[PDB]
Amino acid sequence: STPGAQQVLFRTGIAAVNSTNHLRVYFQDVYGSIRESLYEGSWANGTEKNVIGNAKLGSPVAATSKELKHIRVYTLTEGNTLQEFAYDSGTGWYNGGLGGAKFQVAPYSCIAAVFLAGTDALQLRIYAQKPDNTIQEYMWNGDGWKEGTNLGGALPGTGIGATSFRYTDYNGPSIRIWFQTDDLKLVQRAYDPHKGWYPDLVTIFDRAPPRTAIAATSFGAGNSSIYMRIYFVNSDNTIWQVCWDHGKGYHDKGTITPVIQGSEVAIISWGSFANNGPDLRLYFQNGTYISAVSEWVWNRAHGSQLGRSALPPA
Amino acid sequence: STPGAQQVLFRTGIAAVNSTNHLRVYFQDVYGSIRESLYEGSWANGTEKNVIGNAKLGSPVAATSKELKHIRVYTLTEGNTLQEFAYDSGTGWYNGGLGGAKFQVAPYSCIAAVFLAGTDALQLRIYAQKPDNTIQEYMWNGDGWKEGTNLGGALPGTGIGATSFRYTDYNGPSIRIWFQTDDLKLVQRAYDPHKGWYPDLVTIFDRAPPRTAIAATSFGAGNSSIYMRIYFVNSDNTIWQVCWDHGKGYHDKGTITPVIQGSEVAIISWGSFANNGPDLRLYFQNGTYISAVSEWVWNRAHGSQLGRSALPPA
Numbered sequence: 015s016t017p018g019a020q021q022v023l024f025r026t027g028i029a030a031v032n033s034t035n036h037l038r039v040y041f042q043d044v045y046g047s048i049r050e051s052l053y054e055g056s057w058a059n060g061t062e063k064n065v066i067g068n069a070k071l072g073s074p075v076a077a078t079s080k081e082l083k084h085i086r087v088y089t090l091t092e093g094n095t096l097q098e099f100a101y102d103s104g105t106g107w108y109n110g111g112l113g114g115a116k117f118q119v120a121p122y123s124c125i126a127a128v129f130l131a132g133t134d135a136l137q138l139r140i141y142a143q144k145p146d147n148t149i150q151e152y153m154w155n156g157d158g159w160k161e162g163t164n165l166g167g168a169l170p171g172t173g174i175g176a177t178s179f180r181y182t183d184y185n186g187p188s189i190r191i192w193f194q195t196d197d198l199k200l201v202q203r204a205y206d207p208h209k210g211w212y213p214d215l216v217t218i219f220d221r222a223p224p225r226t227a228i229a230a231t232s233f234g235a236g237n238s239s240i241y242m243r244i245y246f247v248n249s250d251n252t253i254w255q256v257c258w259d260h261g262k263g264y265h266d267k268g269t270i271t272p273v274i275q276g277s278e279v280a281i282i283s284w285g286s287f288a289n290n291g292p293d294l295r296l297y298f299q300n301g302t303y304i305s306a307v308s309e310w311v312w313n314r315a316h317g318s319q320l321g322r323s324a325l326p327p328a
Numbered sequence: 329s330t331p332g333a334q335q336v337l338f339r340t341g342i343a344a345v346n347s348t349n350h351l352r353v354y355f356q357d358v359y360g361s362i363r364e365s366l367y368e369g370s371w372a373n374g375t376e377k378n379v380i381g382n383a384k385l386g387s388p389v390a391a392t393s394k395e396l397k398h399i400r401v402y403t404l405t406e407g408n409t410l411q412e413f414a415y416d417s418g419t420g421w422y423n424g425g426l427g428g429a430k431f432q433v434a435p436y437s438c439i440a441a442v443f444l445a446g447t448d449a450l451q452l453r454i455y456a457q458k459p460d461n462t463i464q465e466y467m468w469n470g471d472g473w474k475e476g477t478n479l480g481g482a483l484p485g486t487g488i489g490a491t492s493f494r495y496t497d498y499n500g501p502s503i504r505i506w507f508q509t510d511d512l513k514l515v516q517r518a519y520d521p522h523k524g525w526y527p528d529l530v531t532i533f534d535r536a537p538p539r540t541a542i543a544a545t546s547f548g549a550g551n552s553s554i555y556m557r558i559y560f561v562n563s564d565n566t567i568w569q570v571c572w573d574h575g576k577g578y579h580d581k582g583t584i585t586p587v588i589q590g591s592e593v594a595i596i597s598w599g600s601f602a603n604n605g606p607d608l609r610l611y612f613q614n615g616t617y618i619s620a621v622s623e624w625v626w627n628r629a630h631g632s633q634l635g636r637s638a639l640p641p642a
């Protein structure tokens with residue numbers, strides 16, 4: 015292993031954001047600090063000098079962005095309230111206002127976050143689990159944090175995946191989120207601006223390990239058309255992928271890569287099938303230098319391939 | 329799930345002590361507190377009122393006893409120093425002297441603990457991993473804590489199992505410990521009073537998951553004879569057992585029971601083959617009520633069976 019790799023928490027929460035091929039990756043160190051690694055032509059950072067804040071040890075770690083102009087990172091405090099670390103170009107890193115709302119969640123809650131797509135306005139939806147085990151939406155629309163739609167019960171400690179896209183024939187954004195129910199199914203819930211939250215859950219996978227990681231992305235939005243990918247850790251200790259592709263629906267599922275038992279997972283994407291893409295990047299732990307974070311790549315050039323073996327600070 | 333099971337930390341460290349079929353089990357709750365559940369005819373406790381102390385979230389939890397007269401429970405402070413909760417009949421619970429020594433270990437260190445067998449005197453040996461990744465022994469011989477023997481390098485974050493027995497033809501106690509080496513092997517190291525720490529590391533399993541749980545017990549000591557069982561979580565997400573039986577050596581290995589990815593493991597035993605025994609109890613998480621602790625049992629009457637489904641507080 016390496017002294018750097020040893021600083022990375024085993025089964026750390028992982029998140030990532032990007033603007034095309036400009037990448038940032040968030041993780042927790044063994045002391046509970048949240049650090050940023052970065053790719054700008056090459057990999058750097060992830061050191062003690064790249065701490066953005068502190069969270070309870072074992073905290074979920076979620077992140078969302080508008081390119082790399084605005085980045086928001088969500089974790090849990092020792093008190094099990096949602097908090098936010100914020101980057102704005104020209105301002106740098108600071109503590110955003112979510113903390114002030116003191117939103118109290120289950121000790122075992124996960125977190126997902128999205129900027130609403132297709133607008134220059136900064137609008138955010140956060141998902142987490144309340145003590146009664148229901149999934150709660152929290153909203154920022156430029157004038158303070160408020161609760162949004164409660165989306166019903168889930169498995170206590172369920173992973174939460176989430177994405178926002180805007181159809182080019184729609185006048186507003188859509189949201190899709192994914193979690194695990196008590197019966198151990200992985201389900202989709204869905205928001206469109208006409209039907210609101212659709213009443214029904216759609217099953218994406220019959221049986222998954224209890225509290226498995228869940229990470230999602232979407233790309234290539236068109237006229238009432240989208241592409242989506244959802245990832246989880248199956249019982250074979252590999253990440254599995256589920257595809258939505260326009261005109262085919264939920265039509266493909268299969269293993270992608272081996273990981274450590276109980277690895278967390280982050281996904282980013284950019285581009286589209288119509289324009290020589292997409293590009294996908296997955297981050298996870300697979301045992302490289304024991305505790306380092308590893309990368310998986312997909313692009314048109316070469317399809318599925320292992321990427322950076324050990325991320326900084328490894 | 330159940331509300332009680334929701335209080336138990338996912339992938340909690342687990343330790344267990346006993347006097348024959350009088351049992352105690354220790355675990356961490358979602359807030360970082362170490363709780364005791366109990367079996368005296370039936371299962372009890374493990375509630376907020378049965379907290380014996382606090383430790384960093386995700387701390388290893390080890391325990392050793394002399395029957396139930398003297399119990400010692402070892403975990404890590406937020407500062408990554410070893411600490412001790414102690415019970416003596418007639419006194420109750422108290423924080424033991426161990427914290428006075430300020431032994432600093434690696435933030436990812438595990439812990440094992442044994443009272444030395446075959447003496448009424450209270451002699452302790454604790455094992456953990458220093459920042460240089462070597463396994464260090466720490467000793468109490470009735471007049472203050474100090475470092476004992478350093479047992480060399482091991483995989484960073486390795487599980488550590490230990491047991492002490494005393495052969496009926498020896499003038500003093502033996503120690504066996506087990507851990508994982510950088511090549512992912514599981515190995516034994518050994519202390520006998522004529523050879524001190526043996527020079528050889530003896531391989532007991534060729535390849536195991538990185539940082540897998542390791543728990544060990546021993547029973548039926550005779551003249552130059554002993555029975556040992558070592559447990560670990562294998563890549564198939566089940567506990568495996570390695571057997572030493574007198575006259576056969578390290579002769580068997582196979583699966584015992586399924587567990588969640590990354591489950592920790594605790595083992596106790598009592599009795600002997602020559603006296604209609606032994607009894608074994610194993611403790612772990614297998615997904616019952618998502619996050620409850622479960623029991624597996626072995627005895628002569630019915631052999632291998634699942635015990636109590638979900639321990640208190642579930």
Ligand SMILES: CC(=O)N[C@@H]1[C@@H](O)[C@H](O)[C@@H](CO[C@@H]2O[C@@H](C)[C@@H](O)[C@@H](O)[C@@H]2O)O[C@@H]1O
Pocket residue numbers: 086098100102105109110111112136137138154
């Ligand atoms: C000096 C400066 O740039 N201040 C910013 C304000 O002008 C702006 O209104 C706030 C908005 O709040 C932050 O971003 C939003 C999207 C949310 O994440 C919110 O929680 C966060 O505080 O940002 C600066 O203070």
Ligand SMILES: CC(=O)N[C@@H]1[C@@H](O)[C@H](O)[C@@H](CO[C@@H]2O[C@@H](C)[C@@H](O)[C@@H](O)[C@@H]2O)O[C@H]1O
Pocket residue numbers: 557569571606608626
């Ligand atoms: C029919 C047969 O071979 N039965 C044997 C018994 O003779 C023997 O007692 C038993 C030993 O089991 C081993 O030891 C116990 C304590 C436990 O660890 C088991 O997992 C081991 O296999 O094996 C029966 O199979």
Ligand SMILES: C[C@@H]1O[C@@H](O)[C@@H](O)[C@H](O)[C@@H]1O
Pocket residue numbers: 035036037053295309311321322
């Ligand atoms: C954007 C870059 O794409 C590929 O070149 C990868 O090998 C790098 O790790 C990075 O993800």
Ligand SMILES: C[C@@H]1O[C@@H](O)[C@@H](O)[C@H](O)[C@@H]1O
Pocket residue numbers: 038050052082083085101
């Ligand atoms: C968008 C910004 O990009 C670089 O300037 C980094 O140093 C910052 O931490 C941030 O990620």
Ligand SMILES: C[C@@H]1O[C@@H](O)[C@@H](O)[C@H](O)[C@@H]1O
Pocket residue numbers: 139151153162163205
């Ligand atoms: C995009 C939508 O915004 C508001 O109307 C919320 O109440 C909904 O739950 C959804 O997030």
Ligand SMILES: C[C@@H]1O[C@@H](O)[C@@H](O)[C@H](O)[C@@H]1O
Pocket residue numbers: 190202204216240258
């Ligand atoms: C992107 C697609 O949008 C709607 O048609 C949903 O009913 C589908 O499940 C899918 O989420």
Ligand SMILES: C[C@@H]1O[C@@H](O)[C@@H](O)[C@H](O)[C@@H]1O
Pocket residue numbers: 243255257292294312
């Ligand atoms: C963008 C790519 O789309 C399909 O070809 C999938 O089979 C790949 O796994 C990847 O998700």
Ligand SMILES: C[C@@H]1O[C@@H](O)[C@@H](O)[C@H](O)[C@@H]1O
Pocket residue numbers: 349350351367609623625635636
């Ligand atoms: C010592 C006891 O043995 C069996 O009767 C089990 O069913 C109990 O859970 C307990 O372990």
Ligand SMILES: C[C@@H]1O[C@@H](O)[C@@H](O)[C@H](O)[C@@H]1O
Pocket residue numbers: 352364366396397399415
């Ligand atoms: C040996 C002792 O037994 C009972 O008194 C319990 O209440 C204590 O916690 C301790 O385990």
Ligand SMILES: C[C@@H]1O[C@@H](O)[C@@H](O)[C@H](O)[C@@H]1O
Pocket residue numbers: 400412414423424425426450451452468
């Ligand atoms: C056996 C001894 O008991 C008490 O004296 C504790 O304070 C010591 O640290 C040790 O565990």
Ligand SMILES: C[C@@H]1O[C@@H](O)[C@@H](O)[C@H](O)[C@@H]1O
Pocket residue numbers: 453465467476477503519
């Ligand atoms: C029982 C023995 O006691 C002391 O002599 C120590 O130096 C050894 O390491 C061993 O623990």
Ligand SMILES: C[C@@H]1O[C@@H](O)[C@@H](O)[C@H](O)[C@@H]1O
Pocket residue numbers: 504516518530554572
């Ligand atoms: C109990 C046995 O004792 C010695 O013979 C060791 O060399 C063996 O490995 C085993 O631990």
Ligand code: NA
Pocket residue numbers: 025026027072073074
């Ligand atoms: Na976690």
